[PDB]
Write a protein that binds this ligand. Structure first.
Ligand SMILES: [Mn+2]
Ligand SMILES: [Mn+2]
Length: 293
């Protein structure tokens, strides 16, 4: 697997008209999936990470915005990175997006990290775009290969014992971090339970305790649920993604939770910015922001 050739071709379109494809070979992408899958399984499902690092929310196949994020934040390994999931679907270039991310994971496995979003799940990305991209530009066997890889992604991360990170949010079934560590891989995303909630739940300002989620999956949780979680586990901040927010980032529960969304102008019918959170050595948070067009 010629990793540097793959990364070079993926980065070659920097400065091109947004939309220009990078078409790797089928064997190259299969190798990216197989090798990254091995690395994901070799690392904990609950990552224990160190600052400084940069944290990114949803990308949803907006490959040229991913390139802008790296241009702003420093291409790996000049900065350490944690991504919070939802790499595919909706956008036009899920394939270039996920291939660059997997290539950086293989090249910099201790300095580059990917969590699982609810779209890294076959039943979701069958309908929402990624299956169609694979069928058109490669074949469905490659889509299954991607699925096998997604099923091994880690689910959450803790930065310096203080910042808890996942795609969705908290769970009424999450009482101990050991519950996350005991989750076995590979796995699909179940329709209920701890793993589902970590990828699907949402914070809600108008909810007390746990409420019903409008997505039809998982729950909503209020500010008191966040405060109790931080106190019980001696944490300072929940960092999650999953929801479009106008500024690219949005604090919640007196800045005890932050939502990150890194795909600007989402789907075309969203005038949102995309944001990336910079976490310095003392865990102080700042933002780099792709303003809407
Ligand atoms: Mn999303
Ligand atoms: Mn999501």
């Amino acid at each position: 697997l010629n990793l540097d050739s793959i990364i070079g071709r993926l980065l070659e379109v920097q400065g091109s008209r947004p939309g220009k494809n990078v078409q790797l070979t089928e064997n190259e992408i299969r190798g990216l999936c197989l090798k990254s899958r091995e690395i994901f399984l070799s690392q904990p499902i609950l990552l224990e990470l160190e600052a400084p690092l940069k944290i990114c929310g949803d990308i949803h196949g907006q490959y040229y915005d991913l390139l802008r994020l790296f241009e702003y934040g420093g291409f790996p390994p000049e900065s350490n990175y944690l991504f919070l999931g939802d790499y595919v679907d909706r956008g036009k270039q899920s394939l270039e997006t996920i291939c660059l991310l997997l290539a950086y994971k293989i090249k910099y496995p201790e300095n580059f990290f990917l969590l699982r979003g609810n779209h890294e799940c076959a039943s979701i990305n069958r309908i929402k775009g990624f299956y169609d991209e694979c069928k058109r530009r490669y074949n469905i066997k490659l889509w299954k290969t991607f699925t096998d890889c997604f099923n091994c992604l880690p689910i959450a991360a803790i930065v310096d014992e203080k910042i808890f990170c996942c795609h969705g949010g908290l769970s009424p079934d999450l009482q101990s971090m050991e519950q996350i560590r005991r989750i076995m891989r590979p796995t699909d995303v179940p329709d209920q339970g701890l793993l589902c909630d970590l990828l699907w739940s949402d914070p809600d300002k108008d909810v007390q305790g746990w409420g019903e989620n409008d997505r039809g999956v998982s729950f909503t949780f209020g500010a008191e649920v966040v405060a109790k979680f931080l106190h019980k586990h001696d944490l300072d901040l929940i960092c999650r993604a999953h929801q479009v927010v106008e500024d690219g980032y949005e604090f919640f529960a007196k800045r005890q939770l932050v939502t990150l969304f890194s795909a600007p102008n989402y789907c075309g019918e969203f005038d949102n910015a995309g944001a990336m959170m910079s976490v310095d050595e003392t865990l102080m948070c700042s933002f780099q922001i792709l303003k809407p067009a």
